[PDB]
Design a protein around this ligand. Structure first.
Ligand SMILES: O=P(O)(O)OC[C@H]1O[C@@H](OP(=O)(O)O)[C@H](O)[C@@H](O)[C@@H]1O
Ligand SMILES: [Mg+2]
Length: 209
């Protein structure tokens, strides 16, 4: 194995709560009831545009293509203010060490997140240096569960998805990894780890075989 493709939220850190808060604020702003925690599970690793459609689907309010755009920027502007306080403190357990062990063992590291804020978040956590590249969700043809972002992360570091491990916390993201041809190891409640402190290189390798 040659590369590890990282989900961001759920793996490196998680800004899920800020994400939900900003979508809540938006839904309340547009009078669209019932965007709750239970609903927000449905939003993990989905792009901003996809997340909004699912919110908009609730009230079956069509908002012809320019409006839809704007509401996304509103939600983004809020969410961006909320994550100004991210720091190296929000690094998930065992992730720094893993990054370190990866790079020292000559395994490429790429970000395969659905989030356009991935680079900002990575910079705040002082993690930029570890990443050999970042899949641009702007360039990518479809969000998780499509494989496109994982294919793009692998390509960025000069590897096939088939020479890669993908690390994920949502089912759509697992599905995206599986279908890229890379190897999923998830974290949450078919290899599954209870938490990111079990994501050590020794484990990752032992799973490869
Ligand atoms: O461009 P944005 O609005 O910042 O990000 C889009 C999405 O990024 C995803 O990050 P990930 O794929 O888990 O690392 C989040 O899980 C998802 O809840 C969010 O809608
Ligand atoms: Mg995620």
């Amino acid at each position: 194995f040659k590369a590890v493709l990282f989900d961001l939220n759920g793996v490196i850190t998680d800004t899920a709560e800020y994400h939900f808060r900003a979508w809540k604020a938006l839904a309340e702003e547009i009078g669209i009831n019932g965007v709750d925690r239970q609903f927000n599970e449905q939003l993990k690793g989905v792009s901003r545009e996809d997340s909004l459609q699912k919110i908009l689907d609730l009230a079956d309010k069509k908002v012809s293509a320019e409006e839809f755009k704007e509401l996304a920027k509103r939600k983004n502007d809020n969410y961006v203010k909320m994550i100004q306080d991210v720091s190296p403190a929000d690094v998930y357990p065992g992730i720094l060490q893993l990054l370190k062990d990866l790079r020292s063992n000559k395994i490429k590291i790429a970000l395969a997140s659905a989030s356009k804020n991935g680079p900002f978040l990575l910079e705040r956590m002082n993690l930029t240096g570890y990443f050999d590249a970042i899949a641009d969700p702007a360039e990518v043809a479809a969000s998780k569960p499509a494989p496109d972002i994982f294919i793009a992360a692998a390509h960025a570091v000069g590897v096939a998805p088939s020479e890669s491990i993908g690390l994920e916390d949502s089912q759509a993201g697992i599905q995206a990894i599986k279908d890229s041809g890379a190897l999923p190891i998830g974290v949450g409640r078919i290899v599954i780890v209870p938490d990111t402190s079990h994501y050590t290189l020794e484990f990752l390798k032992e799973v490869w075989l």
